[PDB]
Every structure is written in structure tokens, then in C-alpha cells.
Design a protein around this ligand. Sequence first.
Ligand code: FAD
Ligand code: FAD
Ligand code: UQ1
Ligand code: UQ1
Ligand code: UQ1
Ligand code: UQ1
Ligand code: H2S
Ligand code: H2S
Lengths: 407, 405
Amino acid sequence: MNHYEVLVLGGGSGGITMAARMKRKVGAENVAIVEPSERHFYQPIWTLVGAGAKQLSSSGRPTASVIPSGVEWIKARVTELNPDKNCIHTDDDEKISYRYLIIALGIQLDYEKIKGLPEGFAHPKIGSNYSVKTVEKTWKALQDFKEGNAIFTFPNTPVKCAGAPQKIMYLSEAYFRKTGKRSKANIIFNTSLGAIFGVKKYADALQEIIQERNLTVNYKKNLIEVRADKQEAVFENLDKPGETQVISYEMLHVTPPMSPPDVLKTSPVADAAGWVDVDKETLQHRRYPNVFGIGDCTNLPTSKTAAAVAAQSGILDRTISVIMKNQTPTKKYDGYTSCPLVTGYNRVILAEFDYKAEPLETFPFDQSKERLSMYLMKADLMPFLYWNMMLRGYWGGPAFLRKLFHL
Amino acid sequence: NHYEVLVLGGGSGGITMAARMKRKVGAENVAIVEPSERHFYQPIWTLVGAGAKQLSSSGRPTASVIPSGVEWIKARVTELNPDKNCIHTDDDEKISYRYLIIALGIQLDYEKIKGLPEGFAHPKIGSNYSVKTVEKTWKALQDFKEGNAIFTFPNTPVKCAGAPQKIMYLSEAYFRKTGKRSKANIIFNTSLGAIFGVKKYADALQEIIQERNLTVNYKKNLIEVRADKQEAVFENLDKPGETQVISYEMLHVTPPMSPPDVLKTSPVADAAGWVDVDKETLQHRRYPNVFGIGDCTNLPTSKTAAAVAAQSGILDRTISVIMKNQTPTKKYDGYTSCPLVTGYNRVILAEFDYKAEPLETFPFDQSKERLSMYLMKADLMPFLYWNMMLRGYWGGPAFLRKLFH
Ligand SMILES: Cc1cc2nc3c(=O)[nH]c(=O)nc-3n(C[C@H](O)[C@H](O)[C@H](O)COP(=O)(O)OP(=O)(O)OC[C@H]3O[C@@H](n4cnc5c(N)ncnc54)[C@H](O)[C@@H]3O)c2cc1C
Ligand SMILES: Cc1cc2nc3c(=O)[nH]c(=O)nc-3n(C[C@H](O)[C@H](O)[C@H](O)COP(=O)(O)OP(=O)(O)OC[C@H]3O[C@@H](n4cnc5c(N)ncnc54)[C@H](O)[C@@H]3O)c2cc1C
Ligand SMILES: COC1=C(OC)C(=O)C(CC=C(C)C)=C(C)C1=O
Ligand SMILES: COC1=C(OC)C(=O)C(CC=C(C)C)=C(C)C1=O
Ligand SMILES: COC1=C(OC)C(=O)C(CC=C(C)C)=C(C)C1=O
Ligand SMILES: COC1=C(OC)C(=O)C(CC=C(C)C)=C(C)C1=O
Ligand SMILES: [S]
Ligand SMILES: [S]
């Protein structure tokens, strides 16, 4: 059986980052990454790609070019995890054993749980910044928008980047004003949630924008169907089960329902919900001590962002090194996460918070204000630091910056 | 192999729907896929764990509830391919269907709690949710000398959201009946922030909680059993990372629950793994010849046999009108019922709908503890279950509610 000291499932943000970190700790030849996609994506830039401000192609690199050099790339899907036997199966009918397992499988997109998707995306006027196949369709829908409803959704599931479904709404609103068709757009956010954002400071700041820019937010409204040929969307009222609503759109941005990766859903490593069942402070698996999880696939109760991945990777690096010495991990994850809320083509509200859902801002100024500096940071600095620093394992979140800024 | 109507699951919903469908398409045209040689009337397990009923009476051979002529395929569904109108079993058969009813129930995941289910081999710990452990609840009640009696509620959806609480009230009564109430610290550690989802019954239970000196710790979720050391580990869902190791003299575990594994990844599931059905008609949202009933569905109401009965009424009409190329007009209202056993002789009969507002069958106030409702729960409902519901003649008590008004 193929064997690696450190086996990393998923070659995404978390998996590459931990592979680079683990390469430095155990040597590259003892690390393998299981990843089926030929292409690795800096997904946060898809917000700006859907708004026409960045190019799709710049958002991706070949997976081979982000594999830490010398680490083995197993180009395959994990199809089963047998942690009791310290091994996994791949869809190449190979079994791979490990001494340590890092699970970074991300979150799965379930567009097909909406009736009418993904077939509907073959039609104009509908996009989704969440898929490489559909984010440019967001932008085309935004360009071709003449008049009517512009509808942005948020599903009844966990989600990666809970801000992205409204980032594209603010961007669309700014685009309508830039091109003089704001008058002709009724902009609706139908979210499954009961609040616009889960942290009070930034929720209030977004509320001001919603009022100030005549945005409509319908809470507890969940998209369940797209009739893309008729340019109609069906939303269910989660507060009144059985009640639905058919609304016409001139533009629809769909945030798909998301779920644990199918292979994790039924796995012993998952909790009952399907997420990788890890210690919420050390990211060590609760039942399999040589198993670790990072990022969207875990049950860490914080927002599912790449920023959380970065902070998590610093913690998990310490956790695994301590576990290898057969010691007890002492460095705790605080739930650090960040949501750079793009509120226009040149403004970001930089939401940063922790497990308590209270602000944990990096910079000495008030990040609840729409800032140019934070837009530039999100649009131009963060991709660079992602490719050249985070993926090389040299970025563990901005906590040191926060502590250095508080002198 | 082909059946006009294939029923997945030979539990409450499956047998009920197979009986109704037998009457509509003929026994020879219905099949039930069900691995278990025994069919259980699970609601009595609450009373079995309190020693007031017996496990043997809870179960009958599955063969004796399969409606005569309906084919019993003794296997596990291992895959659903609704685009091809077929399922696969663990006998590596394909079974095709014209119409599919999914009644796979809810899955118990004791093994998501570190230390379970191995820790059940040790005394002082039971669970009313499993035929393997409900008698262990009762022995833990009997062997209790002194300390904490801990009753849990997990951070998942569950069937019978009241049962984890019921056995707490029964345990309290058992402690008073045998004189050891003074020596029992009785704690309900629930992942929820409320004792019950319907305010009328929540407040009734709140009074019982205060009056009987019960402790409720909200947002506390069992993550680990150290059964040899008699310790339970809870995570504080309000402060991630924070846990608490509590000593117990008795632990009743309500396991984490989840959609059955085969549905979790299936095309018929919504994103969370529940069968994605129309909330009023129980027709699948995306596969018009698929239907769901009971715990395995995403119907946003409590997962109870009572809900199943009311849903079987609606789903019967739904499938009939679909087979007749009609559009469905009869709408499920989310009716469900929780017979909250609050003692060995009292029940608060919670009945409510999708609005989580009371929808009581009887003319009197059911938020009061009542001997009549206990007798209904303990003696009438099992009889109506075996001899009416599983034969297709019980569609919930809505006609009773309207005849009583
Ligand atoms: C539109 C959008 C905007 C976003 N904006 C932001 C933002 O502004 N800021 C921010 O911090 N975050 C943002 N994010 C979130 C960020 O992209 C993710 O949180 C981050 O990628 C999570 O890392 P991960 O490694 O857990 O998942 P991923 O990076 O998605 O990696 C998971 C990997 O696992 C692989 N995989 C899946 N199934 C299997 C299998 N069975 N076997 C093997 N491999 C498998 C996948 O191919 C993928 O490569 C955004 C996301 C989206 C979609
Ligand atoms: C302790 C307890 C107390 C309860 N008390 C009450 C009460 O007072 N009132 C009330 O209304 N309800 C109560 N309930 C709830 C009630 O028992 C259930 O809601 C009811 O059984 C749901 O019916 P179902 O058919 O959806 O699932 P089930 O009755 O559980 O049946 C599902 C069936 O699917 C089968 N199955 C599973 N996986 C597969 C597979 N892969 N292939 C094939 N078959 C499969 C199982 O063997 C099972 O027979 C209680 C439940 C418990 C556990
Ligand atoms: C229906 O969409 C809207 C909201 O979502 C519920 C708001 O919160 C707000 C802000 C609320 C008030 C009362 C000014 C506005 C203006 C609005 O149009
Ligand atoms: C691109 O993903 C992101 C990170 O990971 C690379 C961050 O660390 C952070 C936080 C970074 C700083 C400089 C506060 C943000 C906002 C982010 O969006
Ligand atoms: C540039 O390299 C980095 C460090 O070295 C100075 C850090 O300490 C840290 C943070 C570590 C702690 C313990 C706050 C990060 C995130 C980092 O990226
Ligand atoms: C066995 O499970 C149950 C039902 O299904 C048969 C019910 O219909 C009902 C409701 C029945 C009446 C007469 C109110 C209850 C309370 C119940 O517990
Ligand atoms: S995000
Ligand atoms: S129940």
C-alpha cells in the first residue's frame, strides 16, 4: 500500500498551505496531496470577477505549480477514509496509508439541489460567483441587465464566505449607478438567514448601506427553484413552510446550497453533520488522534474563509509538531476569520472576528467604515500574498500584525 | 425487477405507506425494502427505559407487519438512482419502480460521541433511542445510588424531540418513588437554547422544571463518554473551545442523529441529506415520481410517528392524484404530536403544526399534565399503531380535532 508520513486530502487553500508547512517539518518526500483538479483557484477574487473588476484566468494556477516542490501530487479523488486502518481510498482504486492525515477537502457546492440548476446556467441573466463555470456568467448578467429585478440569494446551508452573496449585490448596485441604470433595477437579497451579517458592528454598517442604497433584503427566503428559460426564481418562506413565491428577475446571482464533501458525509471522521470532527482549539480530530482538519470541511464554528484557513494553518502547524513529539497541544485557535465585505468597486468593510462573533480587527482604525485601503488590500495585496506567502506556508493570519499595531 | 410502488424502509412510514399503496395499486405491485427482521414501535421505548413497559412488547417480526402480498425485500438500500427510476440493494440487485416512497427514518450516530457505543458495555449509562440500550437506561435508573443524573440532547435534528426530556421526568419520579430523590442531581444538558419549541408546552415544562428542582443547561452538547470513569464531556456551544467534564451516576444519551447514510450523498437529498420533498404534498421537489415520509424527510416539523400518520394521509392523496395525472390539492400542515410523559401517570400532549403553534385535538387544555393522555400514550397509541396505522387507517387526529369542535 502506498504510504506517506503526512497525507493531505485536498489541494486547495488549506491543503497546499498545510502541505508546504508539513514539507518543512517532515521533508517533502514524506508528504502527499490527494487532489483531482488540475487547477487551483484563489476563490476570493471571484467576487471581483463576477463584478467585472478582475479576470477569471488570473484567479487560477495549475495545481502542479502550487504543489510544494518535491511533495507528491496524487491526482485523484478520495472516495473513502478508513481512519481505524490509517488509510484512504482513491478513485484510482488505490489505497494510501498515512501516519498523519490532514483533511482539507473544502466545502462542496450543490447547485443541483435547486430545481433548474445547473442546467439553468446555460441561459443568460443568471450567474454564481461560487463556481468557475458560472462566475463570468454573473458578470455577463450584470452587463446585459437592462431593467427589472436583480436578485441575490443566500441558501439555507452553511456556506464558504458568508459575505460573498451580498458583496456581489453591493457591486451590482454600484455598477448600475456607474452605467446610469440604477433607476431601472429593483435590487433584492433573498437570504435564508434572519440577519444581514452575524457580527453586530459590521451588520449595522451593512444595514446603513442597505437603507442608503435602497436595497431590499427579504429574510428567511430561500431559493428552491430556477426556471431560467422564463427568467423566474422560486423562493420558499422558511418562516411559513409550504409558502413559496415566484419572482421574475432581470439578473439572478445564485449562492448554491453547500454541504460537506460527499466522501466526508458518511465517513467515520465526520461529525453527525458531515464536517470533520476536530478539537475546536487545536484542529486535532476528536476521535482519531493522528487526524487533523483545516478549513471549510471542518466543524470549526467560525465563518468558512481562507483567512480562517490561514490562522488555522498556524495553529495546526503547532498542533501537529506537538503531537509528533507526543506532547499535548497548548496553542489554541480562537476562531479568527475575516470577511472583506466589498461594498463597491473601491470600498471594503473588513470584517474580522473570532469564535465569539465579536470584532477582532487588525488595524488601529475602525474597519466597519467602507475603506479604500481595505479594498486595495483585498483586490491586489491578498492574491499576491496568497500565492507567494500563504500557499508557501508563511501566512498564519494577521494576529501578529494586530498585536504589533497595538503598541 | 420492477414494482409500481417501491417503498424504502419498513418502519412506521414505510409499512403505513405500503399498506395504503397496497389498497391503491394492489399488493403484488408494492415492494418494501427493509433489512430488519423486527419492526419496532419506538415510542414505547421511553416507557421501557423508565421500567414501566417491556422491550419485547415494542417489537414484532417485520414479516407480520408487511401487508399481505406486498413483497418484502430483506436488504439495505445502498444507492438511489432516481434518474434511472431504480435503487440498488446490498444484494447487488437493481430494483426499478414507477413511484418511489422513501421512509428510511433517521439514523442514530452514537459513534459520533467519543467512547460510544463501546461505553454502553459499562453500567450507569443507557439510551432510549436504541433497542440495544433502552433496557440499560432502566438498569441505570435502578442501580442509581447518588450523584448526577444526566440527560442529554444533541446538536442535530432528532426524532421525538421530547423523549430526551421525558425520561428525565420519569427518572425524577422514579427517584421520588424509591426515596432517593435527595441524592440525585438531575441535569438536562441540551444543545438547544429552549426546553421545547412550542411556547405553550415550553412554559408548562418550565413550571415542572422549577417545581421538581430540575436543572437545564442550555447550549451544552455531549461530545464524549468516559464510561469506565463515569464522566461525560460536554462542549459549550456558546463558547467554542470550552468544554466541561461532568461526573454522573446515570447518563441517558440522546445520540446525534442524521439522515441515513445512503440518503446523505444521494440525488434525492437536499444539501443536508434529508429527502427533499414539497413541504405540503410530500412529492419530491425534483423527481416527480419520488415521495418521502417521516424522519428521513426535510419536512420542517418535529420528527414523530404522529407526524408520520398525518403525513401518510396527505401522501396517500398526493400519490393518488399524481397517478391520476391530477394536481395535488391537499396540503400537509406540519401536524405533529409529542406526548410529553411527565411522570409514570401523566402526559402533556403537545400537538402543533408548521407554525409551532398549538393544534390540540382535545377540547381541554393539553398543556396540563393529564392521566387521560398518559393512558392514551401508554395503552391506546400502541394499539392504534399496530392495528390501525400500519394497516393504513390512521391519518392523524385532525377529524377528531374537528369533530371535537
Ligand atoms: C465567491 C467566493 C468568494 C470568497 N471570498 C473570500 C474572501 O473575500 N475572503 C476569504 O477569506 N475567503 C473567501 N472565500 C473562501 C475561500 O475560498 C475558502 O474559504 C477557502 O478556499 C477554504 O479552503 P479549503 O482548503 O477549506 O477549501 P478549498 O480551497 O476549496 O480546497 C478544497 C479542495 O479539496 C478538493 N477536493 C474536494 N473533494 C475532494 C475529494 N473527494 N478528494 C480529494 N480532493 C477533494 C477540491 O478540489 C479543492 O481543491 C470565497 C469563496 C468564494 C467561493
Ligand atoms: C425513544 C423514542 C420515543 C419516541 N416517542 C414518540 C412518541 O411518543 N410519539 C411519536 O409520535 N413519535 C415518537 N417517536 C418517533 C417515532 O418512533 C418515529 O418518528 C417514527 O418511527 C418515524 O418513522 P419512519 O418510518 O420515518 O422511521 P422508522 O420508523 O425509524 O423506520 C425507518 C426504517 O428504515 C429502515 N432503513 C434504514 N436504513 C435503510 C436502508 N439503507 N435500506 C433500507 N431500509 C433502511 C430501518 O430499518 C427502519 O425500519 C419516538 C422515537 C424514539 C426513538
Ligand atoms: C425589505 O427590504 C428592506 C429591509 O430588509 C428587511 C430593511 O431592513 C430596511 C431598513 C429598515 C427600515 C425600517 C428603514 C429597508 C429600508 C428595506 O427596504
Ligand atoms: C485572502 O484570504 C484572506 C486571508 O488569507 C490569506 C487573510 O489573512 C485576511 C486577513 C488579512 C489581513 C492583512 C487583516 C483576509 C481579509 C483575507 O481575505
Ligand atoms: C511572516 O511570518 C509570520 C510570523 O513570524 C514572524 C508569525 O509569528 C505569525 C503569527 C504567529 C503567532 C503565534 C501570532 C504569522 C501569522 C506569520 O505569517
Ligand atoms: C404513536 O405515535 C402517535 C401517533 O401516531 C399513531 C398519533 O397519531 C398521535 C395523535 C393521536 C391522537 C388521538 C391525538 C400521538 C399522540 C402519538 O404519539
Ligand atoms: S468571505
Ligand atoms: S415524541
